Motif scaffolding. Sequence first.
Motif, PDB file in Angstrom:
ATOM      1  N   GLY A 129      43.245 -34.541  47.238  1.00 52.73           N
ATOM      2  CA  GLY A 129      43.802 -34.147  46.064  1.00 52.73           C
ATOM      3  C   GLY A 129      43.743 -35.213  44.891  1.00 52.73           C
ATOM      4  O   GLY A 129      43.530 -35.032  43.875  1.00 52.73           O
ATOM      5  N   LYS A 130      43.778 -36.444  45.475  1.00 57.98           N
ATOM      6  CA  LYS A 130      43.524 -37.472  44.324  1.00 57.98           C
ATOM      7  C   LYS A 130      42.256 -37.664  43.940  1.00 57.98           C
ATOM      8  O   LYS A 130      41.896 -37.942  42.811  1.00 57.98           O
ATOM      9  CB  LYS A 130      44.202 -38.688  45.172  1.00 57.98           C
ATOM     10  CG  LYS A 130      45.347 -38.810  45.385  1.00 57.98           C
ATOM     11  CD  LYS A 130      46.664 -38.723  44.058  1.00 57.98           C
ATOM     12  CE  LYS A 130      47.925 -38.568  44.361  1.00 57.98           C
ATOM     13  NZ  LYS A 130      48.118 -37.994  45.685  1.00 57.98           N
ATOM     14  N   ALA A 131      41.397 -37.525  44.895  1.00 57.43           N
ATOM     15  CA  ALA A 131      39.959 -37.799  44.852  1.00 57.43           C
ATOM     16  C   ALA A 131      39.400 -36.898  43.691  1.00 57.43           C
ATOM     17  O   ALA A 131      38.680 -37.414  43.073  1.00 57.43           O
ATOM     18  CB  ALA A 131      39.111 -37.488  46.362  1.00 57.43           C
ATOM     19  N   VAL A 132      39.774 -35.781  43.725  1.00 55.92           N
ATOM     20  CA  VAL A 132      38.958 -34.557  42.846  1.00 55.92           C
ATOM     21  C   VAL A 132      39.596 -35.011  41.481  1.00 55.92           C
ATOM     22  O   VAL A 132      38.757 -34.384  40.359  1.00 55.92           O
ATOM     23  CB  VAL A 132      39.551 -33.241  43.131  1.00 55.92           C
ATOM     24  CG1 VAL A 132      38.970 -32.742  44.365  1.00 55.92           C
ATOM     25  CG2 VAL A 132      40.892 -32.880  43.013  1.00 55.92           C
ATOM     26  N   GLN A 133      40.430 -35.774  41.341  1.00 59.24           N
ATOM     27  CA  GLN A 133      40.740 -36.312  39.606  1.00 59.24           C
ATOM     28  C   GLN A 133      40.140 -37.499  39.475  1.00 59.24           C
ATOM     29  O   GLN A 133      40.136 -38.117  38.238  1.00 59.24           O
ATOM     30  CB  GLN A 133      42.425 -36.631  39.784  1.00 59.24           C
ATOM     31  CG  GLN A 133      43.192 -35.571  40.361  1.00 59.24           C
ATOM     32  CD  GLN A 133      44.667 -35.745  40.455  1.00 59.24           C
ATOM     33  OE1 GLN A 133      45.190 -36.239  39.081  1.00 59.24           O
ATOM     34  NE2 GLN A 133      45.385 -35.482  41.456  1.00 59.24           N
ATOM     35  N   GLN A 134      39.068 -38.012  40.166  1.00 61.37           N
ATOM     36  CA  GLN A 134      38.405 -39.291  39.777  1.00 61.37           C
ATOM     37  C   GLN A 134      36.826 -38.771  39.589  1.00 61.37           C
ATOM     38  O   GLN A 134      36.079 -37.999  40.422  1.00 61.37           O
ATOM     39  CB  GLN A 134      38.314 -40.024  41.073  1.00 61.37           C
ATOM     40  CG  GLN A 134      39.712 -40.204  41.471  1.00 61.37           C
ATOM     41  CD  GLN A 134      40.866 -41.050  40.612  1.00 61.37           C
ATOM     42  OE1 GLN A 134      40.339 -41.536  39.660  1.00 61.37           O
ATOM     43  NE2 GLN A 134      42.004 -40.247  40.525  1.00 61.37           N
ATOM     44  N   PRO A 135      35.970 -39.567  38.717  1.00 66.60           N
ATOM     45  CA  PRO A 135      34.567 -39.124  38.514  1.00 66.60           C
ATOM     46  C   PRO A 135      33.746 -39.471  39.736  1.00 66.60           C
ATOM     47  O   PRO A 135      32.717 -38.857  39.798  1.00 66.60           O
ATOM     48  CB  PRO A 135      34.303 -40.105  37.253  1.00 66.60           C
ATOM     49  CG  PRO A 135      35.226 -41.186  37.276  1.00 66.60           C
ATOM     50  CD  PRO A 135      36.525 -40.808  37.820  1.00 66.60           C
ATOM     51  N   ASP A 136      34.181 -40.280  40.416  1.00 65.21           N
ATOM     52  CA  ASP A 136      33.526 -40.627  41.800  1.00 65.21           C
ATOM     53  C   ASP A 136      34.014 -40.253  42.986  1.00 65.21           C
ATOM     54  O   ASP A 136      34.228 -40.812  44.051  1.00 65.21           O
ATOM     55  CB  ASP A 136      32.981 -42.199  42.046  1.00 65.21           C
ATOM     56  CG  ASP A 136      34.307 -42.895  42.016  1.00 65.21           C
ATOM     57  OD1 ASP A 136      35.310 -42.629  41.823  1.00 65.21           O
ATOM     58  OD2 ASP A 136      34.126 -44.335  42.387  1.00 65.21           O
ATOM     59  N   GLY A 137      34.882 -39.081  42.947  1.00 62.25           N
ATOM     60  CA  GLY A 137      35.972 -38.789  44.032  1.00 62.25           C
ATOM     61  C   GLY A 137      35.381 -38.060  45.132  1.00 62.25           C
ATOM     62  O   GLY A 137      35.877 -38.127  46.216  1.00 62.25           O
ATOM     63  N   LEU A 138      34.326 -37.193  45.057  1.00 57.45           N
ATOM     64  CA  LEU A 138      33.642 -36.288  46.092  1.00 57.45           C
ATOM     65  C   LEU A 138      32.222 -36.497  46.004  1.00 57.45           C
ATOM     66  O   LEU A 138      31.584 -37.051  45.027  1.00 57.45           O
ATOM     67  CB  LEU A 138      33.995 -34.915  45.685  1.00 57.45           C
ATOM     68  CG  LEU A 138      35.084 -34.131  46.219  1.00 57.45           C
ATOM     69  CD1 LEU A 138      36.372 -34.857  45.851  1.00 57.45           C
ATOM     70  CD2 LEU A 138      35.442 -32.751  45.724  1.00 57.45           C
ATOM     71  N   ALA A 139      31.567 -36.293  47.152  1.00 54.80           N
ATOM     72  CA  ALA A 139      30.159 -36.327  47.416  1.00 54.80           C
ATOM     73  C   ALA A 139      29.915 -35.080  48.258  1.00 54.80           C
ATOM     74  O   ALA A 139      30.420 -34.795  49.371  1.00 54.80           O
ATOM     75  CB  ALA A 139      29.852 -37.425  48.231  1.00 54.80           C
ATOM     76  N   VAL A 140      29.309 -34.052  47.613  1.00 57.50           N
ATOM     77  CA  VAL A 140      28.806 -32.878  48.395  1.00 57.50           C
ATOM     78  C   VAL A 140      27.497 -32.917  48.732  1.00 57.50           C
ATOM     79  O   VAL A 140      26.604 -33.321  47.869  1.00 57.50           O
ATOM     80  CB  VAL A 140      29.132 -31.623  47.341  1.00 57.50           C
ATOM     81  CG1 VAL A 140      29.108 -30.494  48.546  1.00 57.50           C
ATOM     82  CG2 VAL A 140      30.399 -31.776  46.954  1.00 57.50           C
ATOM     83  N   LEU A 141      27.235 -32.818  49.907  1.00 53.34           N
ATOM     84  CA  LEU A 141      25.799 -32.637  50.460  1.00 53.34           C
ATOM     85  C   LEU A 141      25.477 -31.147  50.467  1.00 53.34           C
ATOM     86  O   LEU A 141      25.924 -30.355  51.118  1.00 53.34           O
ATOM     87  CB  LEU A 141      25.943 -33.200  52.106  1.00 53.34           C
ATOM     88  CG  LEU A 141      24.485 -33.257  52.649  1.00 53.34           C
ATOM     89  CD1 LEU A 141      23.512 -34.099  51.683  1.00 53.34           C
ATOM     90  CD2 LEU A 141      24.454 -33.745  54.006  1.00 53.34           C
ATOM     91  N   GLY A 142      24.482 -30.836  49.778  1.00 54.88           N
ATOM     92  CA  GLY A 142      23.953 -29.463  49.644  1.00 54.88           C
ATOM     93  C   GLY A 142      22.819 -29.317  50.144  1.00 54.88           C
ATOM     94  O   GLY A 142      21.560 -30.136  49.996  1.00 54.88           O
ATOM     95  N   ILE A 143      22.676 -28.078  50.825  1.00 53.51           N
ATOM     96  CA  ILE A 143      21.351 -27.998  51.864  1.00 53.51           C
ATOM     97  C   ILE A 143      20.966 -26.412  51.661  1.00 53.51           C
ATOM     98  O   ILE A 143      21.922 -25.702  51.697  1.00 53.51           O
ATOM     99  CB  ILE A 143      21.904 -27.956  53.290  1.00 53.51           C
ATOM    100  CG1 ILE A 143      22.071 -29.764  53.566  1.00 53.51           C
ATOM    101  CG2 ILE A 143      20.598 -27.894  54.113  1.00 53.51           C
ATOM    102  CD1 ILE A 143      22.514 -29.839  54.962  1.00 53.51           C
ATOM    103  N   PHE A 144      19.801 -26.222  51.294  1.00 55.76           N
ATOM    104  CA  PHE A 144      19.040 -24.919  51.204  1.00 55.76           C
ATOM    105  C   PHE A 144      19.178 -23.952  52.110  1.00 55.76           C
ATOM    106  O   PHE A 144      18.377 -24.452  53.214  1.00 55.76           O
ATOM    107  CB  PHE A 144      17.878 -24.866  49.921  1.00 55.76           C
ATOM    108  CG  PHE A 144      18.099 -25.392  48.916  1.00 55.76           C
ATOM    109  CD1 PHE A 144      19.069 -24.849  47.858  1.00 55.76           C
ATOM    110  CD2 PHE A 144      17.672 -26.394  48.454  1.00 55.76           C
ATOM    111  CE1 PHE A 144      19.177 -25.340  46.590  1.00 55.76           C
ATOM    112  CE2 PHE A 144      17.721 -26.894  47.218  1.00 55.76           C
ATOM    113  CZ  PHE A 144      18.522 -26.337  46.220  1.00 55.76           C
TER     114      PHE A 144
END
Length: 258
Positions: A129-144
């Motif tokens: 919840g804190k991380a989503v308030q930060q510009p570098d809070g999340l890393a999402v790995l996307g795979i087609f």
Amino acid sequence: HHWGYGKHNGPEHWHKDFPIAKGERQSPVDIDTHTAKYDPSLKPLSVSYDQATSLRILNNGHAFNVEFDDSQDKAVLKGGPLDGTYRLIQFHFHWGSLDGQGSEHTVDKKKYAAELHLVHWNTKYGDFGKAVQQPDGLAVLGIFLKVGSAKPGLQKVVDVLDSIKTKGKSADFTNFDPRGLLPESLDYWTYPGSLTTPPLLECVTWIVLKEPISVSSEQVLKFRKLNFNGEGEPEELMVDNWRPAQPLKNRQIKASFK
Ligand SMILES: NS(=O)(=O)c1ccc(NC(=O)Nc2ccc(F)cc2)cc1
Ligand SMILES: [Zn+2]
């Protein structure tokens, strides 16, 4: 009413409740392969999922999430464009009603049948919840995902979907190994972006793998039997739960490969 993917509450309406929908770093985007810049300064991606502890699978009315224990460093993503350690909290998919659409990112305007998102948060922020308030809070790995041969590591997921058909349903989903969902190569494109659903927060470093995985027609057909609605409400198939490409604006997509 509340947001979704229909004619009356779909992506074109989201900006009225979530003004950041028209913001400076929204996702997904089209990846123009000829314009992306190879960045030799990008470090190797480090995917460390050997101690992953999956807990549960949940239909949340927008997609289904396989959730993990993220109270210790058990399954982490590091390296690539990232500084620090990002813990895996869940994965989910976006998919189409037809094999010719369903991904959120596109590659030279090409849409894939679906897209897998492995969502991680930066441990320096303490909780998701804190991380989503930060510009570098999340890393999402996307795979087609493309339709062809079956993906054996996906089948355990497909076979539990009957137990979470409708919104709000969950089921135990322990001992699932997310390494079985990865392609051979970890070559990737990366750019700064956002959550692709409300609240559309601009907190995500996107890492999108070049190499798609193949799943079978039977596998994706089972995704399309899910429901957006709750039990006892009118049935609406959970399909086309993807947001289209958003303007790149003042961003460069970087590639880890030439
Ligand atoms: N499709 S995506 O960009 O990978 C994604 C990932 C996570 C969420 N949201 C989520 O899991 N929970 C959430 C709840 C409240 C918030 F304020 C923010 C995120 C939305 C989209
Ligand atoms: Zn997603």
